[PDB]
Amino acid sequence: SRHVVICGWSESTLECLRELRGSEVFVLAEDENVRKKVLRSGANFVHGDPTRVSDLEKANVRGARAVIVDLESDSETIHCILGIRKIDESVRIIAEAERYENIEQLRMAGADQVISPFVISGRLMSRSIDDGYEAMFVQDVLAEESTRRMVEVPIPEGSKLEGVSVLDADIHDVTGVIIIGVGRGDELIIDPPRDYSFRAGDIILGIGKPEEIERLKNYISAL
Ligand SMILES: [Ba+2]
Ligand SMILES: [Ba+2]
Ligand SMILES: [Ba+2]
Ligand SMILES: [Ba+2]
């Protein structure tokens, strides 16, 4: 119920374990060099072929909290996702796509969230030739968290901000957090209009220093 299955092993999935409890994580892989590394990392190892439905079942993908898929090829990545969806239609699947062409192929396979790090890396490479300021921000906010970080803060039922305009909310002046967007119902609205009214269940996506984030957390609370 709480457990997370990881199909494949890479520096990404390793970094994924940084923020996850390790005894809740089952890593599904065939290779024995991977087994040593998984155990060394304090996570659980399940021997099998992630492109095989039989082994996917054995990994208890059925009731999983989420399944993370990064395999050696976008081909294997796509086949693993297809196999999961034969087992559980509703299970949350997060997958890493290597080639841009295949991002949409991962979605049509049932990936709930796709991440394409080579596409991101490549853009930043070419764009950092003449001006490196976009890359500096990405490194600080999305990687190292030197100063600030992105944050998703949910809006509770008893929230003082319910129904309030984003202009009247003035989240930047109060909190200090730059508001990127607000999502709900698996739909992300970026840079909402001034007349936008907050609803409960809405999630606020923003960027800010640690203190600025606590103030945003504080600002959204019981009436
Ligand atoms: Ba890969
Ligand atoms: Ba091969
Ligand atoms: Ba320059
Ligand atoms: Ba850190």
Descriptive tags:
monomer; 223 residues; alpha/beta; Rossmann fold; Single alpha-helices involved in coiled-coils or other helix-helix interfaces; Alpha-Beta Plaits; 3 domains; six-stranded parallel beta sheet; four-stranded antiparallel beta sheet; 10 helices; 10 strands; 36% helix; 21% strand; binds barium ion; potassium transport; potassium; ion transport
Describe this protein's structure.
- There is one protein chain.
- The chain is about 35% helix and about 20% strand.
- By secondary structure, the chain is α/β, with parallel strands linked by helices.
- It has three domains: about 1-115, NAD(P)-binding Rossmann-like Domain (Rossmann fold, 3-Layer(aba) Sandwich); about 115-145, Up-down Bundle (Single alpha-helices involved in coiled-coils or other helix-helix interfaces); about 145-223, Regulator of K+ conductance, C-terminal domain (Alpha-Beta Plaits, 2-Layer Sandwich).
- The protein has a six-stranded parallel sheet, with helices on both faces. The chain has a four-stranded antiparallel sheet with strand order 7-10-8-9.
- The longest helix is centred in the middle third of the chain and has 14 residues, at about 75-85.
- The protein is globular and about 55 Å long.
- Bound molecules: barium ion (4 copies).
- One barium ion binds near residues 130 and 131.
- One of its GO terms (molecular function) is metal ion binding.
